[PDB]
């Protein structure tokens, strides 16, 4: 079970078998990473919008077109897996799912309509992986550079009609059957503070500055209840650096911004006839970002360092969250440098997983999204981009799917990737809800 | 070695587990797929501009969203490569390729600049793997819905400087100095003459009508010229039908139609705002393809007959041209029932390659295109329409990428897939290239 240690092309790109990313038959190779063996732990990376058209954009920004991402590229065993939703109502396909639905779907292993956390087209609950990890004595935790009420990791610790239902406020007048003076389990932030995952790293400070409207802790504002609970709070990189265990009676909770974290890439947003009427934009770094925010992956390190000492094993998620919003955005720049972001944190996981040799490294995303790489002349109807590439040639993005300003989500098939025990289910076609059942079956629950 | 028989969603989609593909692990089932054994044959299936999103529309509105195509989600080697082409000038990545470029990165194994064919950027000519297969003593065949001089089948047997050259007409004004009155191989038709594999079928029938400038055939036209140099000539699927052997004797040259051979399905092309403004589209049979016209699976039957009367092995590529053409027309009638005319071609050769038992069949595309698959309400600035699956639920489709009547290709890596020996070199991220390294020494060239 090795990962492919290189698989840039291997020389002049101009000449016979220069741009080659093989350098022998992979059949050898191959059979050595099919192992059905335990996992001890799973690592999920998921990039939110993160399709294949978004994996070569920043492979050819950052690392040039035969270039490789030494996370991303690196995972042996891959495949295509569908990500539709349902309609509520006539219980049929919805072809492109938003996060709440995509998320619901591998974290419970049941389809669902858009907007739905932890709850089936019916409004039934049903047990998330990382609820399921917990029970059978497994150390969990919950990783994004987004809020932490993000439809993304709030489908792994809350049960929500609305994923808007963030706190009391939100839940009492759109989830009124969820609201605690209801009697139902709560917000998303109360749910996930019963949830209780070891280690809870994010954004979404804002939402705890809310009171609770009834419960054991009324009055009190969920900040508070989590220090009432015995939870460690962390603000920053030197306090979550020092934290010295994260368990059951000290789980860790680490709020990062008051909403989403800071993007570390800064570019204009792609305008109508852009790569036409401005010069070729290159990413800079975003000078707003404070240096004391810790990256995804020193998140993800940190986890891993608190999680691993759990003998009977992990369950471990992490999304690379502002690919999405930013390729919501028409920001080619943010889009790109999340995704790097996430290629970092994707490294240490399967660095982690290469010495001990029971883990599990699954990297996939939510669904596809809208930025399309065209040609460096292309007249669109769209927001375009001429950008400066690794190989110092222009490339051009595109985002040609909406007039409202918020660039929309498309419904192909994406990459699947896989390291470690239990790999072969990624390969070949399947959809998301496997991706549920995988993880499953790996850690013997 | 086993096939994917079925990969469905397996129940109530609505249901926990019912949208699942997977019925077990797969890590047993992959042991058995890898072969590292010599392939006898291989047939390599093209679907021009079926990228994932092409992939995933044609799934989505003809076996439903949990649906399964029984060719072409059957190959269970699964990865994505990537297929940037060159500036010629330069050197560089262009991140969109042509599919005069991308055919001769797979075909010849050297990367080129868009409307190369056989050609490196400094206008070198490099061997095909059809040229290499015949001169070892193994059958070939090629293939096509195109005209036999579209990029996709012409890069197998032509070396020209533009793709434009199809008779000798084209290639003394725009490649004069591969012009045939001037001391080059020929035009590309002139060149395809000369390749003489066992087996070529598709259309491209007006410019055998041209005459030749200089050489033995100086003064008859290509048609002519093909007669005197022992071509069986056939017209329509009746003529094909009695055809009962293809070698260098008696090559078969099949010419369905002037120019392209009609596509199978038609549908109204999409319109800006067409998902709001327009009633939903069903798909009906296209009234101007007459039952003469042979499908692309008929024409894989006919040629997996003949080349397979050769004991040493047989090379056959099968192109589904007009996914791409029709994507470019921005018509998702056209796209889709030409992805489902694709679909039972790989059939054909799946069927063949399982019993047969040393036949490797690889199914991709060529580069990625247009459309997307977008949210039913989506408010595009390109154009759409409303289409009736058989889930029996609206999806969207968008181009927005151009504002000319074309729309266009695109640079996402996109999903590769094999069956047979030597298909673990497919797993991963790959480059086109590698496609003809693999090929090359599955067949011991
Ligand atoms: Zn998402
Ligand atoms: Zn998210
Ligand atoms: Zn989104
Ligand atoms: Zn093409
Ligand atoms: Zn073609
Ligand atoms: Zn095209």
């Known amino acids: 079970?090795?990962?492919?240690?290189?698989?840039?092309?291997?020389?002049?790109?101009?000449?016979?078998?220069?741009?080659?990313?093989?350098?022998?038959?992979?059949t050898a190779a191959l059979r050595d990473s099919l192992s059905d063996k335990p996992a001890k732990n799973i690592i999920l990376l998921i990039g939110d919008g993160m399709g294949d058209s978004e994996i070569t954009a920043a492979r050819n920004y950052a690392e040039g077109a035969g270039g490789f991402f030494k996370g991303i590229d690196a995972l042996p065993l891959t495949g295509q897996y569908t990500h539709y939703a349902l309609n509520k109502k006539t219980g049929k396909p919805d072809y492109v799912t938003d996060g709440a639905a995509s998320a619901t779907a591998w974290s419970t292993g049941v389809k669902t309509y858009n907007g739905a956390l932890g709850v089936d087209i019916h409004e039934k609950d049903?047990?998330?992986?990382?609820?399921?990890?917990?029970?059978?004595?497994?150390?969990?935790?919950?990783?994004?550079?987004?809020?932490?009420?993000?439809?993304?990791?709030?489908?792994?610790?809350?049960?929500?009609?609305?994923?808007?239902?963030?706190?009391?406020?939100?839940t009492s007048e759109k989830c009124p059957?969820?609201?605690?003076?209801?009697?139902?389990?709560?917000?998303?932030?109360?749910?996930?503070?019963?949830?209780?995952?070891?280690?809870?790293?994010?954004?979404?400070?804002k939402t705890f500055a809310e009171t609770a409207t009834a419960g054991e802790w009324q009055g009190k504002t969920l900040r508070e209840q989590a220090q009432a609970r015995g939870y460690q709070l962390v603000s920053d990189a030197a306090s979550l650096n020092s934290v010295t265990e994260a368990n059951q009676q000290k789980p860790l909770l680490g709020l990062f911004a008051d909403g989403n974290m800071p993007?570390?890439?800064?570019?204009?947003?792609?305008?109508?006839?852009?790569?036409?009427?401005?010069?070729?934009?290159?990413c800079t770094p975003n000078p707003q970002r404070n240096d004391s925010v810790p990256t995804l992956a020193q998140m993800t390190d940190k986890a891993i360092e608190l999680l691993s000492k759990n003998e009977k094993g992990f369950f471990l998620q992490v999304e690379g969250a502002s690919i999405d919003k930013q390729d919501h955005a028409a920001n080619p720049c943010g889009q790109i440098g999340?995704?790097?972001?996430?290629?970092?944190?994707?490294?240490?996981?399967?660095?982690?997983?290469?010495?001990?040799?029971?883990?599990?490294?699954?990297?996939?995303?939510?669904?596809?999204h809208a930025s399309q790489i065209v040609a460096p002349d292309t007249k669109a109807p769209g927001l375009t981009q001429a950008l400066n590439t690794?190989?110092?040639?222009?490339?051009?993005?595109?985002?040609?799917?909406?007039?409202?300003?918020?660039?929309?989500?498309?419904?192909?098939?994406?990459?699947?990737?896989?390291?470690?025990?239990?790999?072969?289910?990624?390969?070949?076609?399947?959809?998301q809800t496997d991706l549920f059942y995988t993880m499953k079956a790996a850690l013997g629950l």
């Open 1 to 26: 079970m090795p990962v492919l240690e290189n698989r840039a092309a291997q020389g002049d790109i101009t000449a016979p078998g220069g741009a080659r990313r093989l350098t022998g038959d992979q």
């Open 126 to 170: 049903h047990p998330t992986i990382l609820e399921m990890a917990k029970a059978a004595g497994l150390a969990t935790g919950n990783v994004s550079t987004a809020e932490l009420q993000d439809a993304t990791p709030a489908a792994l610790v809350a049960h929500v009609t609305s994923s808007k239902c963030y706190g009391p406020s939100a």
């Open 177 to 205: 059957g969820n609201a605690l003076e209801k009697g139902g389990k709560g917000s998303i932030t109360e749910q996930l503070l019963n949830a209780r995952a070891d280690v809870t790293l994010g954004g979404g400070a």
């Open 263 to 282: 993007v570390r890439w800064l570019g204009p947003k792609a305008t109508y006839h852009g790569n036409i009427d401005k010069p070729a934009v290159t």
């Open 338 to 368: 999340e995704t790097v972001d996430l290629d970092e944190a994707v490294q240490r996981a399967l660095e982690f997983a290469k010495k001990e040799g029971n883990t599990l490294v699954i990297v996939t995303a939510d669904h596809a």
């Open 390 to 431: 690794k190989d110092g040639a222009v490339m051009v993005m595109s985002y040609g799917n909406s007039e409202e300003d918020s660039q929309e989500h498309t419904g192909s098939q994406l990459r699947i990737a896989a390291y470690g025990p239990h790999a072969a289910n990624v390969v070949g076609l399947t959809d």
